[PDB]
Design an enzyme around this catalytic site. Structure first.
Site, PDB file in Angstrom:
ATOM      1  N   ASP A  67      -7.408  -6.515   8.745  1.00 56.35           N
ATOM      2  CA  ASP A  67      -6.896  -6.780   7.433  1.00 56.35           C
ATOM      3  C   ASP A  67      -5.941  -7.971   7.194  1.00 56.35           C
ATOM      4  OD1 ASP A  67      -6.143  -6.136   4.779  1.00 56.35           O
ATOM      5  OD2 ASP A  67      -5.132  -4.373   5.355  1.00 56.35           O
ATOM      6  N   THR A  68      -6.379  -9.167   6.775  1.00 56.98           N
ATOM      7  CA  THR A  68      -5.485 -10.268   6.402  1.00 56.98           C
ATOM      8  C   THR A  68      -4.460  -9.954   5.286  1.00 56.98           C
ATOM      9  OG1 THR A  68      -7.220 -10.940   4.996  1.00 56.98           O
ATOM     10  CG2 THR A  68      -7.186 -12.091   7.074  1.00 56.98           C
ATOM     11  N   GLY A  69      -4.708  -8.967   4.426  1.00 53.66           N
ATOM     12  CA  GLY A  69      -3.801  -8.617   3.336  1.00 53.66           C
ATOM     13  C   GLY A  69      -2.798  -7.593   3.762  1.00 53.66           C
TER      14      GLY A  69
HETATM   15  C1  LIG Z   1       3.404  -5.917  -1.345  1.00 47.32           C
HETATM   16  O1  LIG Z   1       2.517  -4.778  -1.451  1.00 47.32           O
HETATM   17  C2  LIG Z   1       1.143  -4.977  -1.393  1.00 47.32           C
HETATM   18  C3  LIG Z   1       0.535  -6.020  -0.678  1.00 47.32           C
HETATM   19  C4  LIG Z   1      -0.857  -6.072  -0.579  1.00 47.32           C
HETATM   20  C5  LIG Z   1      -1.624  -5.100  -1.211  1.00 47.32           C
HETATM   21  C6  LIG Z   1      -3.130  -5.075  -1.074  1.00 47.32           C
HETATM   22  N1  LIG Z   1      -3.691  -4.085  -0.164  1.00 47.32           N
HETATM   23  C7  LIG Z   1      -3.218  -3.903   1.214  1.00 47.32           C
HETATM   24  C8  LIG Z   1      -1.828  -3.344   1.644  1.00 47.32           C
HETATM   25  O2  LIG Z   1      -1.419  -2.251   1.197  1.00 47.32           O
HETATM   26  N2  LIG Z   1      -0.997  -4.023   2.431  1.00 47.32           N
HETATM   27  C9  LIG Z   1       0.205  -3.414   2.984  1.00 47.32           C
HETATM   28  C10 LIG Z   1       1.178  -4.543   2.876  1.00 47.32           C
HETATM   29  O3  LIG Z   1       1.005  -5.571   3.536  1.00 47.32           O
HETATM   30  N3  LIG Z   1       2.181  -4.407   2.056  1.00 47.32           N
HETATM   31  C11 LIG Z   1       3.287  -5.319   2.136  1.00 47.32           C
HETATM   32  C12 LIG Z   1       4.570  -4.557   2.370  1.00 47.32           C
HETATM   33  C13 LIG Z   1       5.448  -4.419   1.281  1.00 47.32           C
HETATM   34  C14 LIG Z   1       6.695  -3.802   1.450  1.00 47.32           C
HETATM   35  C15 LIG Z   1       7.065  -3.335   2.721  1.00 47.32           C
HETATM   36  O4  LIG Z   1       8.332  -2.765   2.844  1.00 47.32           O
HETATM   37  C16 LIG Z   1       8.938  -2.784   4.140  1.00 47.32           C
HETATM   38  C17 LIG Z   1       6.174  -3.464   3.812  1.00 47.32           C
HETATM   39  C18 LIG Z   1       4.930  -4.077   3.647  1.00 47.32           C
HETATM   40  O5  LIG Z   1       4.070  -4.185   4.774  1.00 47.32           O
HETATM   41  C19 LIG Z   1       0.037  -3.019   4.488  1.00 47.32           C
HETATM   42  C20 LIG Z   1       1.283  -2.390   4.995  1.00 47.32           C
HETATM   43  C21 LIG Z   1      -1.075  -2.012   4.676  1.00 47.32           C
HETATM   44  C22 LIG Z   1      -4.352  -3.593   2.170  1.00 47.32           C
HETATM   45  O6  LIG Z   1      -5.276  -4.651   1.998  1.00 47.32           O
HETATM   46  C23 LIG Z   1      -5.001  -2.238   1.819  1.00 47.32           C
HETATM   47  C24 LIG Z   1      -5.509  -1.583   3.115  1.00 47.32           C
HETATM   48  C25 LIG Z   1      -6.166  -0.260   2.775  1.00 47.32           C
HETATM   49  C26 LIG Z   1      -7.558  -0.153   2.791  1.00 47.32           C
HETATM   50  C27 LIG Z   1      -8.142   1.049   2.362  1.00 47.32           C
HETATM   51  C28 LIG Z   1      -7.373   2.138   1.921  1.00 47.32           C
HETATM   52  C29 LIG Z   1      -5.992   2.003   1.927  1.00 47.32           C
HETATM   53  C30 LIG Z   1      -5.390   0.813   2.345  1.00 47.32           C
HETATM   54  N4  LIG Z   1      -6.090  -2.309   0.830  1.00 47.32           N
HETATM   55  C31 LIG Z   1      -6.259  -1.612  -0.314  1.00 47.32           C
HETATM   56  O7  LIG Z   1      -5.305  -0.945  -0.781  1.00 47.32           O
HETATM   57  C32 LIG Z   1      -7.658  -1.648  -0.982  1.00 47.32           C
HETATM   58  N5  LIG Z   1      -8.285  -0.342  -0.952  1.00 47.32           N
HETATM   59  C33 LIG Z   1      -9.528  -0.181  -0.561  1.00 47.32           C
HETATM   60  O8  LIG Z   1     -10.161  -1.217  -0.329  1.00 47.32           O
HETATM   61  O9  LIG Z   1     -10.203   0.943  -1.053  1.00 47.32           O
HETATM   62  C34 LIG Z   1     -10.488   0.749  -2.456  1.00 47.32           C
HETATM   63  C35 LIG Z   1     -11.090   1.805  -3.383  1.00 47.32           C
HETATM   64  C36 LIG Z   1     -10.802   3.165  -3.229  1.00 47.32           C
HETATM   65  C37 LIG Z   1     -11.404   4.122  -4.077  1.00 47.32           C
HETATM   66  C38 LIG Z   1     -12.301   3.725  -5.075  1.00 47.32           C
HETATM   67  C39 LIG Z   1     -12.584   2.364  -5.233  1.00 47.32           C
HETATM   68  C40 LIG Z   1     -11.981   1.418  -4.387  1.00 47.32           C
HETATM   69  C41 LIG Z   1      -7.633  -2.079  -2.478  1.00 47.32           C
HETATM   70  C42 LIG Z   1      -7.137  -0.997  -3.451  1.00 47.32           C
HETATM   71  C43 LIG Z   1      -6.767  -3.297  -2.705  1.00 47.32           C
HETATM   72  C44 LIG Z   1      -9.029  -2.477  -2.878  1.00 47.32           C
HETATM   73  C45 LIG Z   1      -1.021  -4.088  -1.926  1.00 47.32           C
HETATM   74  C46 LIG Z   1       0.362  -4.026  -2.021  1.00 47.32           C
END
Ligand SMILES: COc1ccc(CN[C@@H](C(=O)N[C@H](C(=O)NCc2ccc(OC)cc2O)C(C)C)[C@H](O)[C@H](Cc2ccccc2)NC(=O)[C@@H](NC(=O)OCc2ccccc2)C(C)(C)C)cc1
Lengths: 99, 99
Positions: free
Chosen positions: B25-27
């Site tokens: 996951d790049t995001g």
């Molecule tokens: C700043 O907050 C953000 C930053 C980025 C995003 C975008 N998304 C990511 C994600 O959640 N990234 C997290 C992140 O980097 N957040 C930054 C962050 C912010 C604060 C923090 O505090 C200390 C720590 C942090 O790491 C990481 C930890 C997984 C991941 O790409 C995240 C990984 C994942 C995959 C599947 C299920 C659950 C989680 N992707 C999704 O949430 C994706 N979900 C997914 O693809 O399923 C979609 C779906 C479900 C049901 C029906 C139809 C579609 C989507 C919703 C963006 C499409 C959202 C919020």
């Protein structure tokens, strides 16, 4: 371009006459953008990520100039923290993951 | 390898004697693994994602063998629905995005 991942992979997009900045997300199956003014018909839809679910308006067939590359698809607009380009448009612009 | 995005970029990892599959996951700024047995001392933490924040435990300097490549980083375990390899380990195994 070749993007190395020391910093978030952000890229400029132009959607709806509008200049935006979006995160290139391989772990996003869908494209979701923060609330914005977009022309047209939308369906309600709900999507999940970590934390849970949000309701979004699925707009269908929206053109997007992603870094000079035009693509057309399903864009979801809703209350995301960051604008997310998902694999439904990343495959369009030819993006691959390489290691 | 080169991985296209027509399907979820899943990969096999080996973390703590256990075989698992994770989403490259790049995001993701962080690596959050579904609940599992890790030996160690962890700290609590809250990470954010699209539908809210969750609480996860931080275990530092955990070896992970991602597709035969070894990397050592901070892994957060918690209630993710999918195992996620995020940019803190992706830059370690040399992953870049390309289009
Ligand atoms: C700043 O907050 C953000 C930053 C980025 C995003 C975008 N998304 C990511 C994600 O959640 N990234 C997290 C992140 O980097 N957040 C930054 C962050 C912010 C604060 C923090 O505090 C200390 C720590 C942090 O790491 C990481 C930890 C997984 C991941 O790409 C995240 C990984 C994942 C995959 C599947 C299920 C659950 C989680 N992707 C999704 O949430 C994706 N979900 C997914 O693809 O399923 C979609 C779906 C479900 C049901 C029906 C139809 C579609 C989507 C919703 C963006 C499409 C959202 C919020």
């Amino acid at each position: 371009p070749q993007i190395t991942l020391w910093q978030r992979p952000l890229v400029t997009i132009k959607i709806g006459g509008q200049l935006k900045e979006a995160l290139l997300d391989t772990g996003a199956d869908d494209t979701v953008l923060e609330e914005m003014n977009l022309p047209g018909r939308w369906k309600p839809k709900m999507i999940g990520g970590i934390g849970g679910f949000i309701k979004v308006r699925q707009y269908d067939q929206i053109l997007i100039e992603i870094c000079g590359h035009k693509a057309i698809g399903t864009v979801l607009v809703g209350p995301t923290p960051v604008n997310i380009i998902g694999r439904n448009l990343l495959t369009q612009i030819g993006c691959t993951l390489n290691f």
